[PDB]
């Protein structure tokens, strides 16, 4: 265990992805797919807390996000749950970048 522990430790240190938060939560509802694992993430009002359980709850706490609605619609393998959760959070679109591209006004309608 000690060996494998520190191995995975350094491993995550190497592969670290960058996450952006909006008011502590996730901006838009998203479904993360990885194999046969599908994880649904939904924006939450400030106060509900992390309604996640298992791999998703660990990810949400470790990412920084507070309020988050989740449901595991697929398998219960921790590796695939982490894969599906990270895929859903990485495909997220910022409210800013969209309009920039889209040639609109910052967030204005």
């Amino acid at each position: 265990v000690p060996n494998a522990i520190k191995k995975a430790i350094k491993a995550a240190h190497n592969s670290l992805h960058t996450i952006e938060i909006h008011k502590g939560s996730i901006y838009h509802e998203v479904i993360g797919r990885s194999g046969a694992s599908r994880v649904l993430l939904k924006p939450a009002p400030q106060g509900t807390g992390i309604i996640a359980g298992g791999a998703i709850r660990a990810i949400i706490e470790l990412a920084g996000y507070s309020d988050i609605y989740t449901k595991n619609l697929g398998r219960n393998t921790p590796i695939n749950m982490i894969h599906a959760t990270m895929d859903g959070i990485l495909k997220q679109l910022s409210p800013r970048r969209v309009a920039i591209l889209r040639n609109k006004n910052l967030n204005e309608l």
């Binding site: 901006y27 838009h28 679109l93 591209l101 889209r102 609109k104 309608l109």
Partner: protein
């Protein structure tokens, strides 16, 4: 003027025809596509270019005025990644979706656009909310 060489065909359902064309062009990084022109399809393209997902949409007619085809292009940035992320049609043939104004959907918390044709042709979800009138829901575009 614009000439072609290939025959232009279209599926019978005018919303998902466009959606399949758009998704395939987006996935394959293709730019110029063609399809048969209908007033509903023309009108839906009218609201999309004001909201900014495609650049141009050109409809042409024959010398006899019996057939028309609209040829639109997508808005790719310099690095070649599109503005459309995903399109999904709700009111497919057979099962038509009717939602009142109070139950008008919000696509991706307002980032995407919902196409709703209430009584004066297609209209985006936000302006539909402004008019406090609802109706037919064509497709989800984000």
């Amino acid at each position: 003027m614009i000439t072609t060489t290939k025959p232009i065909k279209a599926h019978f359902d005018p919303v998902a025809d466009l959606l399949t064309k758009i998704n395939n062009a987006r996935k394959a990084k293709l730019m110029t596509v063609t399809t048969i022109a209908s007033k509903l399809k023309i009108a839906i393209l009218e609201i999309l270019v004001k909201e900014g997902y495609l650049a141009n949409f050109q409809v042409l007619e024959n010398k006899s005025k019996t057939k028309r085809i609209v040829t639109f292009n997508l808005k790719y940035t310099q690095r070649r990644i599109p503005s459309i992320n995903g399109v999904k049609q709700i009111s497919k043939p057979g099962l038509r979706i009717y939602r009142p104004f109070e139950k008008l959907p919000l696509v991706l918390n307002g980032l995407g656009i919902a196409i709703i044709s209430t009584s004066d042709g297609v209209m985006t979800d936000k302006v539909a909310r402004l008019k406090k009138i609802g109706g037919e829901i064509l497709a989800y575009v984000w």
